[model samples]
Target: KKVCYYYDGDIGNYYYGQGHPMKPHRIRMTHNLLLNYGLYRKMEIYRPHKATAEEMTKYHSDEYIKFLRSIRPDNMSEYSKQMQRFNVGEDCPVFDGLFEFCQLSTGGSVAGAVKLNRQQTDMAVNWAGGLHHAKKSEASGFCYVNDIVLAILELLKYHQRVLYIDIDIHHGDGVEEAFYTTDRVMTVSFHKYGEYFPGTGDLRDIGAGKGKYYAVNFPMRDGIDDESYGQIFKPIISKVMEMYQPSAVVLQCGADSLSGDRLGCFNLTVKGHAKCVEVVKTFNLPLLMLGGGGYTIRNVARCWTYETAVALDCEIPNELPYNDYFEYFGPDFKLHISPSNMTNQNTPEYMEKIKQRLFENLRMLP
Candidate 1:
């Protein structure tokens, strides 16, 4: 089956402001780079339609939706105070057309889910999806709408069990929160825990009520390399798939974990990032991949576009397209070089400890 890619030009308008870290250029850059590398020709492109209010309310609260629609400050108001109250102003400010942008991104995710359900595509990639931090009524951590949660909700209509794997630097808090009390969905997130935004995903915050053991949070230490990540993630995900036997998998491939990303604390590279994608495909189940948090636009494009190629069972080329990003930003982009291969070399000693802890935790449940 063909891989479906859902995107639109409007996705590039979801920027917070000029100097904000969460820039929309990431999407533009990825689209351009994918085309430059000829990866766009390997998949079927679909322009997503806007998500309806009813579709959004499946995961978000009506009160929160009303609040988002009602507020619109004209550069000067008590918006900051309201933002602090609702967790939507400062880090995730209400910019112009914020509601429309959020809905557009959510629609892309839903469209991806629908395509997957219809078997129109074996794998769907939505570069604008994976806004994992948005809650039912509040927006936090640069996410206005919880696309990840919405996609999972859409997937649940066709399948009973859905497995969500988040590799973003921050935790998949919103997705976990949305399904915290249910065992039908299993969420596994590997993220940098301490000193991060929202400050939630601890090893202990498994899940609540009937969702216990269904949510697994692996909060790793800073400076963790790809070797450690692969060793721990591969085996644990294999075990989870065996135990739960999910019908589908959703992967949030956030590139911020790359080495030089401004917002990420971990030292992962594109090679490590792609290995996680490979692990998911090994399950041989239908998979949906979405881009999440990555501040470095060039790296985000390189990593996600490379993964897109990987999903299509094609080889990534050695030479990348030139973007003149270094001219725009001095030497950082100029000195950057794409990794020759997508494999990790250093194996951290902490891998066994994490594996043991995961096993012990799983044993304690059910």
Candidate 2:
């Protein structure tokens, strides 16, 4: 069966406003790039239904849900400060169709999970999903809904053990928080966390109660290259997969880790991002892929479009394609090739320190 992809034009309505880093044009850029590269022809595409409030409540708090409903900039009310209360007012400002955008993005994730559970597809990609910073009771970062958590909750209905791996530059704090006290899900996140948003995923903050070892966090310092990422992640993830034997794997392939994202500090490139996905594919498990915090529109489009092709077993051409998107970058597009420093051919010395710390943390888990 062909890999499944869920997307819709509604993503364009989810803008955080002009000048904000979390631009909605990313979805359009990715869609157009996929079409330009002919990657769209190799996959099965579907539009997702809006996720029900019940489905959302599986991971989000009722209070928070009500808060989201109440605060609409287009329809101002007494509770206009609801966005501020939820920590989404400024960083993730409320827009005209904010709630609907969250619903559609989350619905796509749910649809992907369902397709995987029913054995309809070996892999599914939902570039609109992976809003990983939204917590159960509050919105942090740019995430207004916890789509990854919702998708995992749906997957858990069919599978006893689900593995969630996040490759975003920021920690998958919301997903980890949702499953931190439960063993049904094993959450592994490799993120840059010296001083980022939500500020939670510390190495020692494994899991509490019965879900101790299920949550794994490898918080690295800035400038983590591909070699270090592969070395640190491959063996540990392989070991954890063997030990846990999860029924399915969900990868949050966020492009913010790419070279030139506005909000990103990491120096990774499209090749490194693809390598992360390739490592997960080695497990040969039913996989669901989603996009997360990528700020550079052109890079995000290139990375995710290439990832879809890779997941479908299609070869990607090395030269980046140019189209109307060139206008978005202007002079930057003239510098066709992205800076080489972001690729990480040589592993940095700091990676060893990170590895030691990661092993030490994992050792404490019993």
Candidate 3:
């Protein structure tokens, strides 16, 4: 069994404030869930640290760091022009202690990547990381400071090739564009495209220049169910691993893809989501697991906590375990999300069609 290098600091203290969709408190729920399941006992926990200004500069611009540090939530109106330029205010607000929160989250990723680079752990976990929507100089889609980029950049220093696979409902625009022309880091994302927020990923937009055949995008239809997800996810990843043969892998397991998400439409149960994690772990690469966009706080906690257990090959009981947020799982204190009963939009025939097209696209990789 691989001892995972994990980091879960005092993340609950950072709140997204009132009326915000991106709740930082869900991370606290996830931590408690892990504790209830006693999964933390299996992994090696690391120090709770924050990435310094200099550390964040590895991926972000210096001026952007200065802006992130200087701006105050109350005085945000004063810097209206800069706020628009940085894409803050609405989605990525200048909340109180925003910079500190960014530093703390980015630090967990930096620590995890550093551990992996040093060969200190076979796997690393950072639920605080995975703000994949943030850009180098601007914030977008409720993400501030792109920690995924920083961590992947760190991996590239030691690892010959790093494969970044995103399972978020939305496309990983920041990461894919960051390495759009680099062959060293191959980025693949499975997202719901078309008239969505920050929409970019499409079936045809592979990669540009040297990044050709390196970047893969699977823009799926709406109301996707577990069977449809599994049918495509398994074969696609299996083929990617065979072709890319990456030395390291970064898995962004966003829980928003689950059914009944506040901002998502997929129908994957917690088990269905964890299946991806299980498959990635079997690859036995120096893996870095990250948490991304999941608006429904409770469901997000379930998916991340359940996925954490999957990475350890530990089976959790069907009935929910004791925890601080037990009431949230009321009516049925169970771990498994009742499999989605709604009509899964994609039919067997439809899936087969897309799978063939995806296979042909993947054949271009090598």
Candidate 4:
């Protein structure tokens, strides 16, 4: 299994704010764990060039891209109107080198797709990408550029069909919204529903037009555990593989869904989260792995780094290795975290209903 890893050192320098949950610094911490854990030697690494305005404009509106390029912290007061118009300066905050940050993340994803298109690698890993909530005309859920959409768009150039699987606690609304009317890309999201941020992933909102039944949503309740998540995730994904038979696949391994995240409510463990990646890996397709929406920086690092190991098919020790951020995982300093004893709100009957409905939707496909 050949693999390609994309990273930009500067991605860690961009800051959302002092108290904001969004932090780019975790990317660096993940990289450090990858290094200390000796996973870097197992894969090909590339520091990809920043994505240009034209590239970003492929999915995002041209005016929105222009706004992203023009807005800056030094000149904040001047574009208050545009900021509100584009839904920035809040969840998608205006920080130093914001556009550059977007460029790096988006560029890594596009470049990864290009590599897969050329068959240079069977799997591509970009921990900096997967801002799944960015829309074409507006930013939402701390996402400014929908890198997953851009990457899937690029993949469409070579693959006849692509499947996008998002396991983030929040719904992957932007990606689903972009492909809601098309059949070329099938989007499946497993998220916490009911009064969640960007609450749009209802199970009934399958897809529209020719894309009907192509979009699959598993609207889960809070306090869900690893076992319950596995019950839904594996069977649905296996069914997707059998039915969709996509030429390529994109898996968003958002660590926020893990237990104890600042903004997430699920109780999944590191191993449980990585198990999602492993199940997808069993398909042996051209896979692009991207990161998204992981708060609690330490756990984010642990999750992605361990996922990276899974990508490379390398097994590292459970005890955490000493790295730059070693102190962050103090006391235990282990690679895995236990799932919280939170109640599993999803009952067997509820899951059975969702599974049967999802299967019915898949049956409607040609």
For each candidate in the order shown, give its overall lDDT on alpha carbons. Answer: 0.81, 0.81, 0.85, 0.93
Instruction: Please count the clashing residue pairs in each candidate, in the order shown.
Output: 0, 0, 0, 0
Which residue window of length 10 is worst by lDDT in model 1? Answer: 334-343
Q: What is the C-alpha lDDT profile of model 3 across 262-301, one tens digit per residue? A: 8887888888888889888878899999889898788888
TM-score of 3: 0.96
Best by TM-score: 4
Which pairs clash (backbone N, Cα, C closer than 3 Å) in model 2?
A: none
Q: lDDT by residue for model 1 over 1-366, one digit each (tens)?
A: 589998887778666886799887688778777776777778998888988778888878887776677667574274556566678767887788888887778888889998889988899999888999998888888887898898998899999999999999899899988888999899999888777776887878778888988888887776777667878888899888888899989999988888778877677778788899988898888899998989877778778877888898888665655653434333444323333243332335555766777777777545
Name the lDDT value of residue 245 in candidate 1: 91
Best of the two (1, 3) by TM-score: 3
User: Model 3 residue 307 lDDT?
Assistant: 86
TM-score of each: 0.91, 0.91, 0.96, 0.99
Instruction: Summarize candidate 2's per-residue lDDT along 1-366 as a digit string, tens digits.
Output: 469999897786676887788887788788877777777778888988888778889878888887776677756566666655778677778788787888889999999999999999999999999999888888878888999999998899999999999999888988998899998998999888766766878888779887887888887766766666778878778767777789899999998887777888777767778887888888889999999988877788878877887798888676556765757645554322254464443246666665676566556554
Q: On a 0 to 100 scale, what is the lDDT of residue 225 in model 4?
A: 86
Against the true structure, candidate 3 has what lDDT?
0.85
On lDDT, the leading prediction is 4
